[PDB]
Each structure stands twice: as structure tokens, then as C-alpha cells.
């Protein structure tokens, strides 16, 4: 039942995400999506973090920051 959904922890992680702000590299990363796009954004994220699977989840996470902040 690998990562059982847990409605509450999804809420808590996203609750802290909005309150804490962004780390200085993520702050650059969200500017980099709007200007340069996901291409260079993933390139910087991969150099910054450990592996490519790290950079996938992170740029998508930041794309959901943008998707919520701009529209809804």
C-alpha cells in the first residue's frame, strides 16, 4: 500500500510550502520557468540537486506553484 494517500499529510506539506516561501534556488527556478522555460530550469535543478528524477519532481512542483498562484 506503498504511499497510502493520507489526505492530511498532503494538506500539511502544501500548507508549509505556501507559508515558508521558497529557497533562493527555487526562487530563481520559478523566474526561470516564466522567462527561459522548463528546458534550462531542469538543467539548473539537476546540477543543484542529486539525480534527474529529483529534477522532474522539483520542476513539476514549481509548475504547480505557478499554476495555483497565477490562475486560482
Amino acid at each position: 500500500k506503498k504511499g497510502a494517500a493520507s489526505n492530511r499529510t498532503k494538506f500539511v506539506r502544501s500548507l508549509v510550502r505556501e507559508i515558508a516561501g521558497l529557497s533562493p534556488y527555487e526562487r530563481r527556478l520559478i523566474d526561470l520557468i516564466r522567462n527561459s522555460g522548463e528546458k534550462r530550469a531542469r538543467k539548473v535543478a539537476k546540477k543543484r540537486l542529486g539525480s534527474f528524477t529529483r529534477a522532474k519532481a522539483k520542476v513539476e512542483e514549481m509548475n504547480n506553484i505557478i499554476a495555483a498562484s497565477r490562475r486560482h
Binding site: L15, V16, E18, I19, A20, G21
Partner: protein
């Protein structure tokens, strides 16, 4: 003049509290409830002192001295632990959650005003953990909540909600923005 080490440290910490630019989830504190509304919150909250250890002991010996030889409603009191208050918000049972502005690690109570704005719980950041402590038989309390209430105090509580909404939440809609502490 020459001061001690700890005196110099707390004075240095005081001026450091002012002169730094601060993140807006902090300095959402110190933009706190004013004198009249604070006094009026406590004029209600003082009617629900949790029954002190002596009072509870004497009453429960009165139960024993009477009932063993020869019906009551559930009594209402203020609710006062952080595990329990953040339990009560999200239940959702809290009608007024009072939050101290001065907490030893600040990181403890930083989520709480915004979680209260999320849940729709009418919160008020009141000034003093000591002042919250007084109404609750503790030295300090960090948080105090008012779940249920006697009907005599119900209308006053609902108005206390509306006064705090207007006085606190409306005056401090700018406080979710604006990094505090740019004092020259």
C-alpha cells in the same frame, strides 16, 4: 557603563529584533489585538477558568463524602494545549483561538494564524503568553481556545468573533504581505 553578559545579549537581541528584515509569516505577530478588544476578550475568557487543582480536589472529595453515604451537564472551559488547539481547529470545533505573540521558539506557532485563516476559524493573536497563562492555571499557554460556551455568553462570543474579524483580520490584510522590520 558596563553591563553583564546576559543583559548585553538580551539588549542586542532586542535591537536585532527591530533592525533585520523579517519574513511575513513572522511580523504577522506584533501586528496584534489592541487594548480594548484584548480586555474584552479576557472579560469573556475569565469566566471559563479551568478548575484549578485545589478546586477539583475539594469538589471530587465532596462527591465522595456525599454520594458514598447518601444529572450534571458537561462543564465548559477554555482549551489550552497546542496539540489540542491544532486538534480542535480542523475538527472543526474552535470559535475563537487566541495565539501568543511571544513564544520561546518562534517556529512553534508560525503555521497557526494561517491554518486558522484556512479552516475559517476566527483567530486573534493576543499579546503575552504570560497573559494567556493567567486565565488557564499555567505559567504560560501559547494558545487558548473557546470551543463551546454557556448561552449567556454565546451572543457576547459571537460579537467577540465579529469585533476581532473587523478589528484584527480586516486591519491586518496587509500583514500577509510586507516584510517587517525595515526601521531605520
Amino acid at each position: 557603563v558596563k553591563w553583564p553578559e546576559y543583559v548585553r545579549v538580551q539588549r542586542q537581541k532586542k535591537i536585532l529584533s527591530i533592525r533585520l528584515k523579517v519574513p511575513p509569516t513572522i511580523a504577522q505577530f506584533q501586528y496584534t489585538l489592541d487594548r480594548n478588544t484584548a480586555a474584552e476578550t479576557f472579560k469573556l475568557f475569565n469566566k471559563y477558568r479551568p478548575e484549578t487543582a485545589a478546586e477539583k480536589k475539594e469538589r471530587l472529595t465532596k462527591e465522595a463524602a456525599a454520594v458514598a453515604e447518601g444529572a450534571s451537564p458537561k462543564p465548559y472551559a477554555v482549551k489550552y494545549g497546542l496539540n489540542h488547539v491544532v486538534a480542535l481547529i480542523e475538527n472543526k470545533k474552535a470559535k475563537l483561538v487566541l495565539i501568543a505573540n511571544d513564544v520561546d521558539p518562534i517556529e512553534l506557532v508560525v503555521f497557526l494564524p494561517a491554518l486558522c485563516k484556512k479552516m475559517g476559524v476566527p483567530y486573534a493573536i493576543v499579546k503575552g503568553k504570560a497573559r494567556l497563562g493567567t486565565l488557564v492555571n499555567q505559567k504560560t499557554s501559547a494558545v487558548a481556545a473557546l470551543t463551546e460556551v454557556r448561552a449567556e455568553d454565546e451572543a457576547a462570543l459571537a460579537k467577540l468573533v465579529s469585533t476581532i474579524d473587523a478589528n484584527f483580520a480586516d486591519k491586518y490584510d496587509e500583514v500577509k504581505k510586507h516584510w517587517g522590520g525595515g526601521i531605520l
